[PDB]
């Protein structure tokens, strides 16, 4: 029942973040967790800032982060111990597989505490250290996420900036970066340097660490927009037939023309356009006046022996299978075809190239687009096969703060509904 990636995960793993404040640790933690869950590895983030704010519930100044503030250090360490006990419960009672421990973890002593904890429980440990000393990057990071964060009340960014830079200075006093030449030569880790310009990778142990490294080395923080839509309405859509390779209806062609105008009105810089190899997506892109790329792996879910049938026909001919699919829509594999779980695996190179690229429009299909949207919007396997992705609607995805905003844009061309709810 588990995904391929989860099949390749054995002992539970602790991903341990390291770095000074405002180095993207929370951003990376959340994003890596979203990716790992989407590929089928149960993962949870443990944000030590959340624990500490819950414990302290006050607007502390940089004074709280001094290494010689004994009472603050005691509280901060207690928060780490509590979070680690929660990590242990997640990975041993709740069937978690990866815990992402999002804290500064800037001293050898604190990292030894985590390593000893992991050894007590036979967890593997992989560190992700973010290193950046460009003051323009740090200032931008502070303005982007720290000025309007729960650590601070309403007050001008100037004063918040001042306090947060002093906080950073407190951590610099005791910061011991990972050192692969001596102290840390046997630890497994990646240093992400200068916002992904440079990386140092040491002692990758296993499959999941290799995948984590590849992912982290191919993401970026440059602003851009991802657009997702389906092909224009197809002949088979009008007949309720699944799969196939039918062409656009005249109304799907009208949508394609409306999509051309939408793009001609947006003037999105350097927009890449990707389609599948199925005629209905190709014909949609042909109307746009742009060059585009056809990806075989964007083809719609394979319904196997059920290709080109209506749901009514499938239920009549295969009643037990049809009922099984309604009970387990994510995991059910069509005979001779695919499950949504298979489709997620097939789409992983799409996700990776979307991460590498800038502005992209993907013209695909109902099931494919559910999978892609679930990745960007952090939707689990229960929800993924039921996300609503109407024909003739564009989903505009904007990376925003720690996640992704979604706006739906319905173009003014009607279409049949192809969304089948789970019965009763
Ligand atoms: N490798 C990185 N290095 C530096 N900044 C990054 C990196 N990755 C993401 N960011 C930036 O970090 C900001 C978010 O910071 P945050 O995750 O809250 O920092 P931290 O948890 O280290 O205090 C965002 O502006 C994001 O663009
Ligand atoms: O998983 P569901 O809800 O049957 O949706 C997938 C189906 O949707 C369609 O894109 C449109 O009917 C079919 O080609 C495909 O088999």
UniProtKB/Swiss-Prot annotation:
Phosphorylation results in the activation of the kinase activity. Beta-D-fructose 6-phosphate binds at residues 52, 76, 104, 110, 146, 167, 171. ATP binds at residues 19-27, 141-146, 322-325, 366-370, 402. One of its GO terms (biological process) is glycolytic process. Phosphorylation by AMPK stimulates activity. Beta-D-fructose 2,6-bisphosphate binds at residues 230, 237, 243, 311, 325, 329, 340, 366, 370. The active site is at residues 102, 132, 231, 300. The record marks 230, 237, 365 as: Transition state stabilizer. Its EC number is 2.7.1.105, 3.1.3.46. Residues 1-222 are annotated as: 6-phosphofructo-2-kinase. Residues 223-424 are annotated as: Fructose-2,6-bisphosphatase. GO terms for molecular function: 6-phosphofructo-2-kinase activity; ATP binding; fructose-2,6-bisphosphate 2-phosphatase activity. Synthesis and degradation of fructose 2,6-bisphosphate. In the C-terminal section; belongs to the phosphoglycerate mutase family. This is 6-phosphofructo-2-kinase/fructose-2,6-bisphosphatase 2. It comes from Bos taurus. The gene is PFKFB2. The chain holds residues 28 to 451 of 531 of the full protein.
